[PDB]
Amino acid sequence: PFIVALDFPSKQEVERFLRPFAGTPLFVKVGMELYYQEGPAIVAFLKEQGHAVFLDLKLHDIPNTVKQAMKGLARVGADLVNVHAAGGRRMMEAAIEGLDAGTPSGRMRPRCIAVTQLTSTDERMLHEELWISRPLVETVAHYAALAKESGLDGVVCSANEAAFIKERCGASFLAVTVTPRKARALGSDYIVIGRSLTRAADPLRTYARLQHEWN
Amino acid sequence: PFIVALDFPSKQEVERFLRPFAGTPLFVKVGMELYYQEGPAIVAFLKEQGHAVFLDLKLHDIPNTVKQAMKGLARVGADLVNVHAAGGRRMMEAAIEGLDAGTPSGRMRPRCIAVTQLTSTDERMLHEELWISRPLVETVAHYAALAKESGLDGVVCSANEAAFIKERCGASFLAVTVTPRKARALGSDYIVIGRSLTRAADPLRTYARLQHEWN
Incomplete structure (x- = not known):
């Protein structure tokens, strides 16, 4: 339910933060600042460490380009990707093709x-x-409906936005987003964790605490 | 005036096409399909070869994220980058800051x-x-006006769209986009050249033709 935002200015510090998690697999998020400086190598690393990856690059381009890019991000080793609904039903549908193709x-x-x-x-x-x-x-x-209609699995939304979207798109439409407890109460499926965990002195215990507040 | 879209599936194929231009510098475009599979290394290569680089990733994210990402793309050696006007004036102004900071x-x-x-x-x-x-x-x-207000140097537009844009934004606002000669008459500053050049058996001769038709 937790997605750890690896918002670090270098592969150096990413590697440093993940050390104690060498034995505890995580679902991590790689934003565009880190990915544009580290390239597909950073995902290989994270994958080797045994972590699942959310490649958050928010692709927004013409259908065919997003498709070939998504095909490439599949090959890379991403477990979750995202796009802009503003890109249109056609582009979103092509993204899904690209993923299956890769x-x-x-x-x-x-x-x-x-x-x-x-x-x-x-x-x-x-x-x-x-x-x-x-x-x-x-x-x-x-936009959420547009995404649901296009075959996407869910959307990124504010916690208190989750119930509205699920009512419109179905409770199986993922809500990626306040307290983990509050977040859970508002209908979110996944919570994106930032400094709360990435900057804690006791990361492993903070993470355990995190799972307990959500439970 | 010419921006060669390096729409190739692999770095090898890219290096193969550019061989004859080892002595003829070009302004090249790196799309998200190529950049997401080669990372910042492909730019270094292009830079080593002596070509100018247009990193066409169409960043669209919250202000701070685009800013940090642009600071990084500047460090990567990009000579031209772009964003979605849909991101808002703040995000676009933030992009300019990141570029200056890097x-x-x-x-x-x-x-x-x-x-x-x-x-x-x-x-x-x-x-x-x-x-x-x-x-x-x-x-x-x-949107073009929005970009001009934000401090951006121009926009990507249709050949038959540049006249309307420059009229609204100023003749100095760049128009990046039909025949070369035609694209020129329609008011464009730069034309993105595709297969007509990248799939030419005589690229150097062909490149010379384009410059002549444009001239």
Whole structure:
């Protein structure tokens, strides 16, 4: 249920933070700052350590490009990827094809969720800048539906946004997102952990604590 | 004036095509399919060869993330990067900061242009899927205006779209995009060359032809 955001400025420190987890597998997130500096090598490392990877690059391009890229991210070793719903139904559908195409027969393709509206986008922005004329809340549900219709597995959403989306898309539509306890109460499926864990003095015990608050 | 899209499935194939240009510097584009499989090393290679590099990754994320990622792409040696205007003025302004922060003093930061509406997005998609209520053309100029307001140097646009853009943003706002000669008459600053060059049996001769037709 936990996705540890490896928001570190180098492979050096990533490696350092993960040392105690050499015996405790984790579901980790690789953002675009780290991936653009380390390349596919960082995923190989994480995979070797035995961790599952969420390659968070938010692909948003034309259908065929996202497809070939997703095919490549499958080959790389990602367990979860994401895209912008703003990319359109066609692009999202092509992303899924790319994943199956880069996934060996029998085995399961890497999960793929969609960004609806970034957590940093407020009403004023949706209104004046993006020129979308429907409340932020409805716009998020719409994009989430678009993603569900396109064959995606879920979406990235604010904790108190999860119930609304699941009501619209089905309770099996993943909600990746406050207290782990609160997060769980709001309907999220996965919680993205940041400094809370990555900057703790006792990472292994903090992680155990984390699982207990959620339980 | 020419930006060669290195749309090849592998680094070997890329190095194979560029061999004859070992003595003829080019402005090349690295898409997300190639960059996500070769990482920052492919840029180093291109840089070693003496080519300028357009890292076309269309970053679209929260402000701080794009900023840290741009600082990194500058360190990687990118001469031109891009972003989605859909990310908002704040994210776009943050991209410029990251680029400056990753550029040595006295040196020039790498250029940054924005995607307004992907060339693969049609009227129906903008209407039904995105929730944007203004015509496609007006939304494009708007987003371009948004990018100009943010400090970006230009945008990616259709050949027959640059006149409208420059009229709205200023003749100095770059238009990166039909025949070379045609693309020129339509107001574009740069034309992305595809298979017509990368799959030419006589690339050096062909390259000379393009420059002549443009001239």
